[PDB]
Design an enzyme around this catalytic site. Sequence first.
Site: not given
Ligand code: HEM
Ligand SMILES: O=[N+]([O-])c1cccc2cn[nH]c12
Lengths: 412, 412
Positions: B111, B114, B283, B288
């Site tokens: 993520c 974070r 968000w 993405e």
């Molecule tokens: C607030 C804005 C957030 C943004 C901008 C964001 C963005 C991202 C991005 C770019 C990835 C890679 C996804 C991909 O390319 O498949 C990711 C993965 C992940 N995020 Fe965040 N995230 C956010 C919030 C969160 C929240 C609220 C949680 C958990 C409560 C979280 C948990 C995770 C987890 C566990 C992954 C791994 C998913 C996987 O391995 O497929 N994220 N996030």
């Molecule tokens: O690209 N994203 O914004 C994104 C990717 C994977 C998980 C989450 C949760 N919020 N935003 C996420």
Amino acid sequence: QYVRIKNWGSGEILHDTLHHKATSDCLGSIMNPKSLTRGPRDKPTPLEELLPHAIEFINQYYGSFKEAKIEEHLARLEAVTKEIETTGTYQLTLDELIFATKMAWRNAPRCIGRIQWSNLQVFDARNCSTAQEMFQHICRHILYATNNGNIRSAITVFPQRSDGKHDFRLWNSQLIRYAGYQMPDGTIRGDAATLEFTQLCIDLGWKPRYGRFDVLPLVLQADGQDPEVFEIPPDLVLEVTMEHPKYEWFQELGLKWYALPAVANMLLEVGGLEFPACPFNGWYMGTEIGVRDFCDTQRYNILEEVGRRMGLETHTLASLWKDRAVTEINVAVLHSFQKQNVTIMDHHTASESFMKHMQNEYRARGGCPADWIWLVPPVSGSITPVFHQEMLNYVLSPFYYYQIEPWKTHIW
Amino acid sequence: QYVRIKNWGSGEILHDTLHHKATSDCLGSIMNPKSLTRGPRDKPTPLEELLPHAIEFINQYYGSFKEAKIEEHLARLEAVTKEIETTGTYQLTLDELIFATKMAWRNAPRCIGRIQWSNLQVFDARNCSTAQEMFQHICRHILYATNNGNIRSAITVFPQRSDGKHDFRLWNSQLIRYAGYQMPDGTIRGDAATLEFTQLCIDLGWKPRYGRFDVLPLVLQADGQDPEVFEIPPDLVLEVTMEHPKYEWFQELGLKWYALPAVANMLLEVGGLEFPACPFNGWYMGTEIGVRDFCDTQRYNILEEVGRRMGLETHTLASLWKDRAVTEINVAVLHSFQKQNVTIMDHHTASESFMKHMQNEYRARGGCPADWIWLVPPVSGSITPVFHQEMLNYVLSPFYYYQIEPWKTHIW
Ligand code: HEM
Ligand SMILES: O=[N+]([O-])c1cccc2cn[nH]c12
Ligand code: HEM
Ligand SMILES: C[C@H](O)[C@H](O)[C@@H]1CNc2nc(N)[nH]c(=O)c2N1
Ligand SMILES: C[C@H](O)[C@H](O)[C@@H]1CNc2nc(N)[nH]c(=O)c2N1
Ligand SMILES: O=[N+]([O-])c1cccc2cn[nH]c12
């Protein structure tokens, strides 16, 4: 206790203590892991270790081409074993060395032009013995490699390591590289990445011409003696003037770069034998100059200004001005090299080729050592095939290891 | 014997045999490594394993805030131990659960948002017991999270795993996702990545509306029973129509995407307890949608045509048309979200923030699990800070593990 981590951007260092609380069952993001480095020596290679490796290699080489030459194989095996027990170390037949270099390249997990692994000019300089003699072999290399713009991949092999205190080593990171001078008024001119090394050249008697693109001197150490400084003949260093095919003001940037990408500080390991000096070269990939050399904040850093000249929202990050800019710098690099008849390949065509190679590699031998973190271009990631290809990173043999910077482990 | 490798682009598979000949002394490029997955069960968690983990967590939570509450700590420690020996498993106080979710997020190496780890809405649905009840909790989640464009991060926690045959699980990859239909004339409409899952929905009674952006149904399985299909109320799914701030023909592409990025199939592990169902959301990050969803050949693949409409040399790869195009698609995504008042962050600002967080993390606790391969944006790599930051990837606790796709390990 704690693992050290460096931010190659701001240079800042950090100590990771948290990893101790890991569950268990990764150092993939590290630059120079000790697993990829092959340091100094003080004693020769213990015969018990040398013989096994040597034997394997002779089997690899002999079990290489179609329809083996068993007679020669067992013969070489014998002749090699004997030589080792009588002399200590041993010499590779010119053919073996050629095979060695191509393989080691082939086994380079970070290289993306490995589809070219078979086309490699080899310069046998194992008989060399002095610095002045190295400088000559290097010049010949540069001249052959450059080939008036039609770049040719080549490698010059200097005498292998013997006892340890007798090592041939090029102190430069790469054959041609620009100098980085710390100016009086605080500003840094030239290649900021070569700051420390530029100083060493100063300390060794080199005369700094305080400019943006001043080609650094060749710092060679032969046999075991101290390193001698030689300036590369300007007629040998072919460069490319940067100009955009639409932006007239691009030429006004006064940018340029050398056409020859020749890594000079790596160690070629083969059949137990190791050559601490073996400068090689291929040809540039656009993104390397346009994205790394030109856009890294720790280098020439030209994004900020190339931006303005494009009328981009330099102060509004979300405007994606950075994406827009770097791409134009990339076209400049690519365009200029094409215009000035100098070989170069764009990252897209390059990736497509690695993918082709990679599949040729599994079909040919079920494997291809690949470090994803290094193969994925610094721009347009997923727009590239390799980004989506899962890959296994592993150190085979022969291999092109890194080595501890000479100015550290060297008594004068 | 041989390691399997998948090219998520062409889908092709490969068997690596060569790695056996490695010297020794890396699976970093793998998508779903078994080390990052937490599969099914058949028996509860052996008390001998549960008690140690449980104890640790209670120490983490209690040794969390400034000026501890030792009285409560030792008290909770006791109350927890007892509950385990009398009931088998145990329940986390609402506060602990909240702490658990934020930490697990905090410990998510992939993520990039974070820095927001502390701002997370938690919906306690541990009392839930039926599918219809899940659907309700999920809808409430979507409604809260969406917030009319001002996206809010939230997570809904369903009943933890007990024996194993009684698992709560969402079969969807993510809350809102588009359907992918294989057309008669061979062409694939919609999201090609959801082809197999779209079929499952068909097989379970869902009526396919054969379109490019048809929102898939919610497939939930409560307690242990078979999965039930529910269609998400259209008023709850907020979308954004793609339009370029300069290219009028962009709107003519008829593109759009959902505003809510909510991962639905992960397992939250905490203090030995594991919740196989806990959909969370933050968000979107521009790249993405614009780079992955829109430009991956295995998805909507819009590069080829967005190129032509720009008058780009679509058939001359070296022209960097792909770089040029994707960037325009990125501005569209970013622009459209901004225009339609829906939260979204560009990859640059996002990276700068992760860097800020990462340093806040080492200063606060000397560490931050980070998977470089996932944190580096699919475009403009080195133009981003994180690219240059070396990082250590490690699985801490609590953690958000992956899990074996339900339709595989599930007897009806
Ligand atoms: C607030 C804005 C957030 C943004 C901008 C964001 C963005 C991202 C991005 C770019 C990835 C890679 C996804 C991909 O390319 O498949 C990711 C993965 C992940 N995020 Fe965040 N995230 C956010 C919030 C969160 C929240 C609220 C949680 C958990 C409560 C979280 C948990 C995770 C987890 C566990 C992954 C791994 C998913 C996987 O391995 O497929 N994220 N996030
Ligand atoms: O690209 N994203 O914004 C994104 C990717 C994977 C998980 C989450 C949760 N919020 N935003 C996420
Ligand atoms: C023919 C064109 C070639 C191209 C386009 C090419 C391109 C590249 C690129 C992009 C990298 C990463 C460099 C960086 O970002 O620092 C690389 C690394 C490397 N290449 Fe190739 N290469 C070519 C030829 C060669 C040849 C001829 C050899 C060896 C005989 C070779 C050996 C290596 C090695 C060992 C590395 C790793 C260097 C390091 O770890 O710093 N390459 N190459
Ligand atoms: C093969 C490679 O691991 C894979 O295609 C990747 C790499 N890194 C990624 N990065 C993110 N953020 N998301 C992804 O899907 C992937 N996939
Ligand atoms: C921290 C990270 O490992 C480092 O900045 C990288 C990553 N991948 C790279 N990729 C290439 N080709 N060259 C590099 O210098 C780097 N450096
Ligand atoms: O980017 N490059 O072209 C490049 C990088 C590193 C080593 C070599 C050798 N030829 N080209 C190289």
